[PDB]
Symmetry: C2
Subunit: 368 residues, 2 copies
């Protein structure tokens, strides 16, 4: 909604909805810059809690607590798709939330997201609504094989042949779905972006992402596939349809034919952007705080040195934690979570390097 | 002389909660260490980046002991606790920095005599305790020379007319006299030392002071004294025990002779640029060292930098411009009470043209 919003100076208070690693890192940028931080999260053990001037323990559905956080802050931002869009909407109406509620609302709804992106003139993966058993017939006819059916609201079945059709019938029964073409994906990249006051926008270096088990495993900067220009064009069509301020990320597929497709949008700092803390002259959190408090953003971000960022899951710590002592060049971030679980994101690692290919090979060896 | 290797999840205690404590605490949490901070003020800048805050004076032995109880390792962020109290603490708890450097540098005479003993380049000096000693200073050192209180007070003696004022410093406290040199440049070397004699140097820093307060740090230093400065640091390390990050400030006189000036056995103001400019910060490496982790073998200057301190009077002047300048990289400490000469923050400007940026900064700060 607001093109121009309050310019808050050091000393003002920033509220953060959610206290995970993302809010943690926001809050550290904020306190570095002289901003006070209030963080809200149901968990007493959230990683953000002891980098906040004040901690409000409550669930994201709790209207009173969210209102207390409003009363306490000169601006509010959010670190995960936690809060309901309806609660967010109410909150934007009463307090200063330059991010607005529109992006969160839209991004909860796979069908409408896909349609507004298509209406934007952005290159989305072809798609169809699968409301009823009968629509699956349409889908085979229009999309696959292979095609993937995902739940429309807030589950996936890959569907390669008829051998997978019965399993798919099962999901449309429970909840409404959306079907997409299943691309033979050459590579995967992302663009982290920050949008500020008076239509200012700045772009981070195109990032190259590897996933393992649908969890981000490796990010390499600079992306080894030149798609910066096309990614920016798609991002620019995106911003005409969806309002962002602060940092957001757009994820992309590159198919077999070097063709670029918008995949997913994160209306917040994103895992694929963490490398920027060490490798850039601003981090995705630095700019997020500048944007949200209404300051000028830098015109460009400089990649000071190339980098390979590895997530650290519970299982990765189990494997690697005894070697950390010996590798200062790993630039460890450890979030502070009490409870290690195998696939839980416990920290990450950013290796600055002049040889990204070689560094990549070292990590494969290292994480096997 | 090796110190416990502490893994993430361990607890670091910080004596003192000013901005140096704050920046240590921020690295520590980044790296997954818990932080307990002690400081007499509820307003201290480090308070809300600590897991725990112990509000207490620096001579509060009971609280100094609660801290040790709660911590796997303790570091001090500044000269705060007395030498004898720090010594007892070091004997009872894990404090890699030790008490020796604090104790030495609390005594200007022994400091000087120990540096000389170590073979470092020290400004020529003599003890002035008694009225007669001034005459030795007149002869040996010559005008001008400066009379500095041995413990803890200062007076510059350009000629005869100042002798009265110096005599009146000798009446009260004990002193050491030094040649007052014409200083052409000041530089400092920030250094981190850890387990197994590992030693890593930051890039040589060129410092400018105004009113005895650090004003501007330029990196890389525009005087080529890196080799020499290291040789001096290597001699000092022989005589003085450091673990963690420490800084040695030097003078260069108008004949290009280098002199050890001051030693800080802790992260130092002139090192803050390294947060934006280098691949590791003086704070990152401090935490690595003090927790018994391996250090990087070198530090890389990713881009040159001009850092300015922001005192209260500088905020008064410039704070309304901050929003237009993301390239200043503003650090604002969080101190509630602004005073004209109090350190409130700093700014680090990365640049590919140090000299142009220095001119820009002189004009911005002139007001």
């Amino acid at each position: 909604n607001a093109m121009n919003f309050n310019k808050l100076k050091f000393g003002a208070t920033i509220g953060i909805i959610g206290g995970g690693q993302l809010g943690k890192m926001m809050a550290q940028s904020a306190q570095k810059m002289g901003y006070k931080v209030v963080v809200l999260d149901p968990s007493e053990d959230c990683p953000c809690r002891y980098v906040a001037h004040e901690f409000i323990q409550a669930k994201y559905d709790d209207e009173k607590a969210l209102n207390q956080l409003g009363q306490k802050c000169d601006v509010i931002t959010y670190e995960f798709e936690n809060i309901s869009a309806q609660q967010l909407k109410l909150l934007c109406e009463k307090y200063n939330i330059p991010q607005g509620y529109q992006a969160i609302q839209l991004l909860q709804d796979r069908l409408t997201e896909k349609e507004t992106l298509k209406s934007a003139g952005t290159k989305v993966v072809p798609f169809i609504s699968v409301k009823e058993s009968t629509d699956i017939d349409k889908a085979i006819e229009t999309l696959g094989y292979p095609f993937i059916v995902k739940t429309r609201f807030g589950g996936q079945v890959l569907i390669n042949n008829e051998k997978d059709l019965q399993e798919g019938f099962k999901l449309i029964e429970t909840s409404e779905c959306v079907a997409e073409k299943y691309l033979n994906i050459k590579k995967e990249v992302s663009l982290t972006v920050t949008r500020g006051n008076n239509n200012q926008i700045t772009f981070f270096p195109l990032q190259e992402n590897e996933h393992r088990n649908q969890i981000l495993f490796k990010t390499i900067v600079p992306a080894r596939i030149d798609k910066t220009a096309e990614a920016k064009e798609q991002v620019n069509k995106i911003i005409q349809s969806i309002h962002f301020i602060g940092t957001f990320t757009v994820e992309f597929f590159i198919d077999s034919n070097n063709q670029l497709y918008v995949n997913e949008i994160a209306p917040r700092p994103h895992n694929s952007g963490h490398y920027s803390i060490e490798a850039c002259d601003y981090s995705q959190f630095d700019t997020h705080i500048l944007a949200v408090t209404g300051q000028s953003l830098p015109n460009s971000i400089e990649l000071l040195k190339p980098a390979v960022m590895m997530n650290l899951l519970g299982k990765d710590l189990d494997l690697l934690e005894n070697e950390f002592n010996e590798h200062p060049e790993w630039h460890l971030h450890i979030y502070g979570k009490s409870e290690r679980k195998d696939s839980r994101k416990m920290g990450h690692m950013t290796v600055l390097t002049n040889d990204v290919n070689q560094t990549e090979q070292d990590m494969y060896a290292k994480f096997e």
